[PDB]
Design a protein around this ligand. Structure first.
Ligand SMILES: Nc1nc2c(ncn2[C@@H]2O[C@H](COP(=O)(O)OP(=O)(O)OP(=O)(O)O)[C@@H](O)[C@H]2O)c(=O)[nH]1
Ligand SMILES: [Mg+2]
Lengths: 172, 137
């Protein structure tokens, strides 16, 4: 068989969504910021629990008015990755609106069990402002969402987080 | 030469302040689903030599100006009169637009085909002050 999993990456402008995707797919990182204006995807062949799957990873605009255009691409997603910046508490605050907007627009049949994963990114930086335990509490309050702390720049937890993403997305 | 269909649509939507349609075009452009230069210049009598940014600044379509600037529009493009978008926001007395353009490092020293700078084109005394301040930098 061939299984294609659709994964959607959401989060505020600048949290590192594009960087996380680029680190996972191409093992490349750039400190140069170019803002994502249009949603678009990369494809990667992933191996999950001795099963080969094609992961279609969608990168979206975090910017405040372009993000409504991302909504058209929610439909059919098998997993939703929510990303925030551990140094920027305003990007943590928006996770609920991102999640609710995804749930009502994508409209899975089983919203309580739909696969989310939450990445708290940029831990390589100094002076984090969002406490690990605070993010963990939010994730737990949403029916035990898996939480990873990542660094796209230093390649910490990117592979592990996307392995969980692949696995939960693959669940029938 | 010619403009693509997406470019004509971008000039039309920018001119008329259809911000959602501008953003749909900019998103399609960013992922290369359509061919269009954000800095294109109009080729019909309705927009000849103007960029989307010129049109949106002159007609005061604020959200459009923002969206174009966030998507990377060049702030110092010239139209056939030698005007920059700053020239046309200053001329029409749009304080928030002049301020937005300065925030994107608009060159306040450009002299248009009439021998005027943006400071010389305006009538609003606040804009005249802002431009005077940025000139001496
Ligand atoms: N130090 C550090 N910088 C990072 C990390 N991840 C991303 N960045 C930087 O943060 C900036 C924003 O990163 P992006 O990947 O473009 O963020 P984005 O989420 O795609 O932002 P939008 O496209 O506007 O929605 C870039 O300069 C990156 O190089 C990280 O893990 N550590
Ligand atoms: Mg991006």
């Amino acid at each position: 068989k061939k299984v294609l999993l659709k994964v959607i990456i959401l989060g505020d402008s600048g949290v590192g969504k594009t960087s996380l995707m680029n680190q996972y797919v191409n093992k490349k990182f750039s400190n140069q910021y170019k803002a994502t204006i249009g949603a678009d995807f990369l494809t990667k062949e992933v191996m999950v629990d001795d099963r080969l799957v094609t992961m279609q990873i969608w990168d979206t605009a975090g910017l405040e008015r372009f993000q409504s255009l991302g909504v058209a691409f929610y439909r059919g997603a098998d997993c939703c990755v929510l990303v925030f910046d551990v140094t920027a508490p305003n990007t943590f605050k928006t996770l609920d609106s991102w999640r609710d907007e995804f749930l009502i627009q994508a409209s899975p049949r089983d919203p309580e069990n739909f696969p989310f994963v939450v990445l708290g990114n940029k831990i390589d930086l100094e002076n984090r402002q969002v406490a690990t335990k605070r993010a963990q509490a939010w994730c737990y309050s949403k029916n035990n969402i898996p939480y990873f702390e990542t660094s796209a720049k230093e390649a910490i937890n990117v592979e592990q987080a996307f392995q969980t993403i692949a696995r939960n997305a693959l669940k029938q | 030469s010619m403009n693509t269909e997406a470019e004509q649509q971008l000039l039309h939507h920018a001119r008329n302040g259809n911000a959602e349609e501008v953003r749909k075009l900019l998103a399609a452009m960013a992922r290369m689903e359509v061919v269009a230069d954000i800095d294109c210049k109009g080729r019909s009598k309705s927009n000849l030599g103007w960029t989307p940014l010129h049109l949106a600044c002159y007609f005061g379509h604020k959200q459009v100006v923002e969206d174009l600037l966030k998507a990377g529009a060049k702030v110092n493009m010239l139209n056939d009169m030698g005007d920059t978008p700053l020239h046309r926001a200053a001329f029409t007395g749009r304080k928030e637009l002049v301020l937005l353009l300065l925030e994107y490092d608009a060159d306040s020293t450009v002299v248009n085909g009439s021998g005027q700078t943006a400071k010389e084109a305006t009538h609003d005394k606040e804009i005249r002050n802002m431009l005077e301040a940025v000139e001496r930098t």
